[PDB]
Write a protein that binds this ligand. Structure first.
Ligand code: UDP
Length: 385
């Protein structure tokens, strides 16, 4: 059976799938992955055949911080669906797939699946959505009124057979979500076509030899993820906040920034562009994180409290949520100072009550499926559909 995974080129939107791809293959299913070259090694390691599309999205964190002019930045994902559909058509012309699985922003995978009337499962790598819970601000539901400005540029080259924008908000037969249903916002509103398996961890690209036995001293991880990590000011404040302190600190600065471009690295710090986050959290006593869903779930999967410094709306939702569920503290940026970094690491470390809350989220996130349940919910959907 040929399963075709369609996704954007983004670590946070593609890493959960890797563990999934490893399982489907272990079940004797050919899995093809429509990605760029940046991800073909990760996809190839899981067992997928990478099939490449030349892409229109930004990958380098520098390019994501600039092109923050916000001229309908949401449209990017639409235009990208319209660049990617033609190339998916060609990639699979004589390799039609039995099952298309597409990430919630890879609309190209929806259109492509419609156009071939092939079964389609939707992976939600962030919060899922439905008729009740539409995620987004006042200003981000009033931006899908400028999504319609481009939707009247849909009749400038081709046409829609009828209404086709209420069919991108609408969920599919099976919608796998990579958090536990408790952590989903408006959980109760989500019916049985949503399947909340929590974090989908497995093997990752071999990162550098970062052995870190630490000692009888506590270990803190610092990372703003893989896209909104282009903030030199923050990485200096962390060095100022925790140099030569109780804490052993491992800080990922992303690909936007030189570990030599900073102040000289304290004896207690390790500083890299990239760390093996799953390995570090196996030893971390605290994680200063940006509230990426992968990071938030990888933390809870390791029993690791959270200081959440969100960069984007999606991330502020996850940041409020972590506070509301008392799984750590919400520290806003443009409120982030060296004193405030210290106050929060203080307030979260040695709150035994808070630590017990994430120790039970550790259970609650593993009690959900994982990649195994998702691969079961997938194959079962294959037999049925
Ligand atoms: O130094 C790093 C930084 C990030 N990641 C991985 O990148 C993903 C980040 O996804 P998330 O949704 O947290 O944030 P995003 O990167 O999408 O902004 C997670 O799976 C991390 O395990 C990693 O492995 N090492």
């Amino acid at each position: 059976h040929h399963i075709s995974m369609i996704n954007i080129p983004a670590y946070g939107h593609v890493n959960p799938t890797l563990a999934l791809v490893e399982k489907l293959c272990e079940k004797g299913h050919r899995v093809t992955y429509a990605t760029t070259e940046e991800f073909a090694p990760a996809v190839q390691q899981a067992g997928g055949e990478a099939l490449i599309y030349h892409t229109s999205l930004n990958i380098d964190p520098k390019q994501i911080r600039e092109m923050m002019e916000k001229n309908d930045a949401t449209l990017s994902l639409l235009k990208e669906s319209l660049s990617i559909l033609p190339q998916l058509e060609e990639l699979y012309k004589d390799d039609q797939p039995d099952l298309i699985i597409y990430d919630f922003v890879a609309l190209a995978g929806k259109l492509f699946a419609d156009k071939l009337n092939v079964p389609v499962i939707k992976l939600c790598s962030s919060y899922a959505q439905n008729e009740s819970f539409q995620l987004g601000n006042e200003d981000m539901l009033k931006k899908i009124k400028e999504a319609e400005a481009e939707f009247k540029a849909y009749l400038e080259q081709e046409q829609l057979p009828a209404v086709s924008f209420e069919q991108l908000a609408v969920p599919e037969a099976l919608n796998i979500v990579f958090m536990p249903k408790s952590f989903q916002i408006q959980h109760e509103t989500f019916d049985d076509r949503f399947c909340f398996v929590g974090p989908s961890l497995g093997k990752r690209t071999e990162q550098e030899s970062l052995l870190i036995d630490k000692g009888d001293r506590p270990l803190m991880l610092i990372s703003l993820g893989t896209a909104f990590n282009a903030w030199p000011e923050f990485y200096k404040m962390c060095i100022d906040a925790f140099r030569d302190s109780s804490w052993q600190v491992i800080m990922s600065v992303g690909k936007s920034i030189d570990p030599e471009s900073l102040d000289d690295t304290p004896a207690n710090f390790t500083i890299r562009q990239s760390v093996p986050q799953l390995e570090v959290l196996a030893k971390a006593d605290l994680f200063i994180s940006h509230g990426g869903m992968n990071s938030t779930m990888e933390a809870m999967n390791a029993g690791v409290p959270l200081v959440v410094i969100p960069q984007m709306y999606e991330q502020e939702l996850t940041a409020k949520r972590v506070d509301e569920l008392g799984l750590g503290v919400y520290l806003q940026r443009e409120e982030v100072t060296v004193s405030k970094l210290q106050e929060a690491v203080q307030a979260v470390s040695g709150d035994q009550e808070l630590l017990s809350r994430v120790k039970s989220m550790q259970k609650d996130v593993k009690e959900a499926g994982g990649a195994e349940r998702a691969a079961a919910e997938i194959e079962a959907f294959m037999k049925k559909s």
